[PDB]
Design an enzyme around this catalytic site. Structure first.
Site, mmCIF file in Angstrom:
data_model
loop_
_atom_site.group_PDB
_atom_site.id
_atom_site.type_symbol
_atom_site.label_atom_id
_atom_site.label_comp_id
_atom_site.label_asym_id
_atom_site.label_seq_id
_atom_site.Cartn_x
_atom_site.Cartn_y
_atom_site.Cartn_z
ATOM 1 N N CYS A 1 3.932 0.971 9.412
ATOM 2 C CA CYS A 1 3.691 -0.004 8.358
ATOM 3 C C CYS A 1 5.010 -0.591 7.876
ATOM 4 O O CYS A 1 5.961 0.139 7.585
ATOM 5 C CB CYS A 1 2.944 0.655 7.199
ATOM 6 S SG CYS A 1 1.506 1.621 7.710
ATOM 7 N N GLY B 1 3.341 5.352 10.070
ATOM 8 C CA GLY B 1 4.709 5.040 9.726
ATOM 9 C C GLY B 1 5.196 3.698 10.225
ATOM 10 O O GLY B 1 6.271 3.252 9.806
ATOM 11 N N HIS C 1 0.811 -1.214 0.000
ATOM 12 C CA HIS C 1 0.000 0.000 0.000
ATOM 13 C C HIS C 1 0.847 1.268 0.000
ATOM 14 O O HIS C 1 0.290 2.369 0.061
ATOM 15 C CB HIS C 1 -0.962 0.003 1.191
ATOM 16 C CG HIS C 1 -0.292 0.203 2.511
ATOM 17 N ND1 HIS C 1 0.142 1.437 2.942
ATOM 18 C CD2 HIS C 1 0.005 -0.669 3.502
ATOM 19 C CE1 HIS C 1 0.687 1.316 4.139
ATOM 20 N NE2 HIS C 1 0.616 0.048 4.502
HETATM 21 O O1 LIG Z 1 -1.605 0.622 13.437
HETATM 22 C C1 LIG Z 1 -1.568 1.749 12.853
HETATM 23 C C2 LIG Z 1 -0.610 2.000 11.757
HETATM 24 C C3 LIG Z 1 -0.987 3.173 10.822
HETATM 25 C C4 LIG Z 1 -1.618 2.572 9.517
HETATM 26 O O2 LIG Z 1 -1.354 1.352 9.340
HETATM 27 N N1 LIG Z 1 -2.425 3.142 8.507
HETATM 28 C C5 LIG Z 1 -2.968 2.492 7.318
HETATM 29 C C6 LIG Z 1 -2.246 2.423 6.092
HETATM 30 C C7 LIG Z 1 -2.773 1.792 4.941
HETATM 31 C C8 LIG Z 1 -4.032 1.218 4.999
HETATM 32 I I1 LIG Z 1 -4.805 0.302 3.343
HETATM 33 C C9 LIG Z 1 -4.779 1.254 6.167
HETATM 34 C C10 LIG Z 1 -4.235 1.887 7.302
HETATM 35 C C11 LIG Z 1 -1.835 4.270 11.541
HETATM 36 C C12 LIG Z 1 -1.939 5.576 11.028
HETATM 37 C C13 LIG Z 1 -2.699 6.592 11.658
HETATM 38 C C14 LIG Z 1 -3.380 6.282 12.837
HETATM 39 C C15 LIG Z 1 -3.303 4.980 13.380
HETATM 40 C C16 LIG Z 1 -2.523 3.987 12.716
HETATM 41 N N2 LIG Z 1 -2.494 2.681 13.330
#
Ligand SMILES: O=C1C[C@@H](C(=O)Nc2ccc(I)cc2)c2ccccc2N1
EC number: 3.4.19.12
Length: 305
Positions: free
Chosen positions: A145, A143, A41
């Site tokens: 990820c 971040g 992604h």
């Molecule tokens: O665990 C997490 C990791 C992070 C995240 O993975 N984002 C995300 C990315 C792609 C998809 I497709 C779906 C989701 C995150 C960002 C902002 C707030 C909370 C979180 N919590």
């Protein structure tokens, strides 16, 4: 003595976390040999996250659109492929810190250490378990990820998890290093509900065995029970049904403590029916299920990697 939630030494995995950047998105990647693994992604915009056509998005992306940085070293991407939900970037330099590694897919109930990272640098390490609904309850911010979960077989780092997304419920989902999602989860910002999360009964029995080894013995009852009858009580309180395979895995623990499995299962039945009456077991007023039987014998016998 003493018993705490331990995680494997993260040293071998630290020398493999790199920073991956595609356009505006930046997440962590895993640099093993001459390949960099990251969640696919990373190639999407904020609008694409609803209904993303990853194969069409990767077509428009060339090698020069991906930026891999290990600390302060930019690795030249030579080939980009997409194995399931994992983006595989072929770099030019083979990582001189690549350990003896192995890609495994863990079954539910198993535990693994997570090294949370942001922009390619490790922040912390913790030990979590694979919930029966194929989710994990971890701490991940934006971040994170690409943060990887791993177990260490003395010298072999068995990579098993890579974080992808936080479900709206607050739990987290990911894939193995081959790209296949743990559970019925797809990589898109859509209402994805996890299943009913049970309690890993075999892990709770191992935790109760760890308590007897480490002093706490109040829950030990004078009673016993059978397997099927105890499973009728486990079904009532949403506990994983126990099998004879689980009884034999708890065999090594049963021999060291001198307490049979069905006698410990009887002590667990009272705790499910009568609660804990405000007491604590190993410093916890709730039954814990994030310790596999093999995790207990590691801390209660003493082995090194
Ligand atoms: O665990 C997490 C990791 C992070 C995240 O993975 N984002 C995300 C990315 C792609 C998809 I497709 C779906 C989701 C995150 C960002 C902002 C707030 C909370 C979180 N919590």
């Amino acid at each position: 003595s003493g018993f705490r939630k331990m995680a494997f030494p993260s040293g071998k995995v630290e020398g493999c976390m790199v920073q991956v950047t595609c356009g505006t998105t930046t997440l962590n990647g895993l640099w093993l040999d001459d390949v960099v693994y990251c969640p696919r992604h990373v190639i999407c915009t904020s609008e694409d996250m609803l209904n993303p056509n990853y194969e069409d998005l990767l077509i428009r992306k060339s090698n020069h659109n991906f930026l891999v940085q290990a600390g302060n070293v930019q690795l030249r991407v030579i080939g980009h492929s997409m194995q399931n939900c994992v983006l595989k970037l072929k770099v030019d330099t083979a990582n001189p810190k690549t350990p003896k590694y192995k890609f495994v897919r863990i079954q539910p109930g198993q535990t693994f250490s997570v090294l949370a990272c942001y922009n390619g640098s490790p922040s912390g390490v913790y030990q979590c378990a694979m919930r029966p609904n194929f989710t994990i309850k971890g701490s991940f911010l934006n971040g994170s990820c690409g943060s990887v979960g791993f177990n260490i077989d003395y010298d072999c780092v068995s990579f098993c998890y890579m974080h992808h997304m936080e479900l709206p419920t607050g739990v987290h989902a990911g894939t193995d290093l081959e790209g296949n999602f743990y559970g019925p989860f797809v990589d898109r910002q859509t209402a994805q509900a996890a299943g009913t999360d049970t309690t890993i009964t075999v892990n709770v029995l191992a935790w109760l065995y760890a308590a007897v080894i480490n002093g706490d013995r109040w829950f030990l009852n004078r009673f016993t029970t059978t397997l099927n009858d105890f499973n009728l009580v486990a079904m009532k309180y949403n506990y994983e049904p126990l099998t004879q395979d689980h009884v034999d895995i708890l065999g090594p623990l049963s021999a060291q403590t001198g307490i049979a499995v069905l006698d410990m299962c009887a002590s667990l039945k009272e705790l499910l029916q009568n609660g804990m009456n405000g007491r604590t077991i190993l410093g916890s007023a709730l039954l814990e299920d994030e310790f596999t039987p093999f995790d207990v014998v590691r801390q209660c016998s003493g082995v090194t990697f």
